[PDB]
């Protein structure tokens, strides 16, 4: 059965992500709402649905940390200078990231982000990073809980896309 057949979408579905563990599918598009569907075979029902006014969304991602695997954030963003982060609690507590900590000129839209894991490499402490693709060649990497700008990576040309690879080292 078509997953959003239970509750129709009012726009083109711009991004789409499953949960890492739960049977949940998050859809979202330019009608500035994001919907979670409990999927199964027969009856894909709608878990919950949050309409962010004035903020059409273009990328929406389930993040789930590696330390305790108990956070379950949803990071979502469109052609805006902010990016929302909903903390899943089953009212809804969402926060807004809107500060590039000195780097606002090189990041004028939070559209193309990706969420990934990062290790401290002096402790064995991981934390999530969001990675924003900016204007010149810039990728602005920032913390997924505090929003602090961690580092930036500039390529030479027109940055078009990027991806995240991981490689294990030891135990």
């Amino acid at each position: 059965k078509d997953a959003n057949a239970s509750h129709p979408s009012h726009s083109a579905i711009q991004s789409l992500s499953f949960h890492p563990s739960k049977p949940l599918l998050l859809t979202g598009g330019y009608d500035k709402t994001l919907r979670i569907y409990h999927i199964d075979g027969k009856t894909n029902h709608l878990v919950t649905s949050l309409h962010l006014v004035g903020s059409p969304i273009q990328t929406c991602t389930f993040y789930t940390s590696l330390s305790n695997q108990n956070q379950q954030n949803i990071f979502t963003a469109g052609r805006r200078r902010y990016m929302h982060s909903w903390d899943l609690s089953l009212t809804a507590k969402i926060e807004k990231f809107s500060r590039l900590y000195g780097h606002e000129s090189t990041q004028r839209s939070f559209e193309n982000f990706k969420v990934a894991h990062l290790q401290n490499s002096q402790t064995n402490s991981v934390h999530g990073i969001v990675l924003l693709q900016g204007n010149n060649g810039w990728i602005n990497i920032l913390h997924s809980t505090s929003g602090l700008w961690l580092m930036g990576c500039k390529i030479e040309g027109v940055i078009t896309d990027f991806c995240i690879d991981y490689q294990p080292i030891s135990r």
Partner: protein, 86 residues
Amino acid sequence: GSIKFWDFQFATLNQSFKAHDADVLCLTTDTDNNYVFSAGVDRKIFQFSQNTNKSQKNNRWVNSSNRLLHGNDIRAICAYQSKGAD
């Protein structure tokens, strides 16, 4: 006003500092490249340092200091460093 440091192989930026308020006309370095001094039309001389062992093993310049000594501009800067002259 920005001062950028670029890895030569891979031809790509390592770190950018937003140091001056207007153009950076002239910049220079010492012998062992523990410091980079820089100056321009906003008439301050900035010093970017990499002298710490952690700075040298991490290749991380820091924006160490900044002095206001000139009256109008700085169009030329140079450095000499010897046993009895630095």
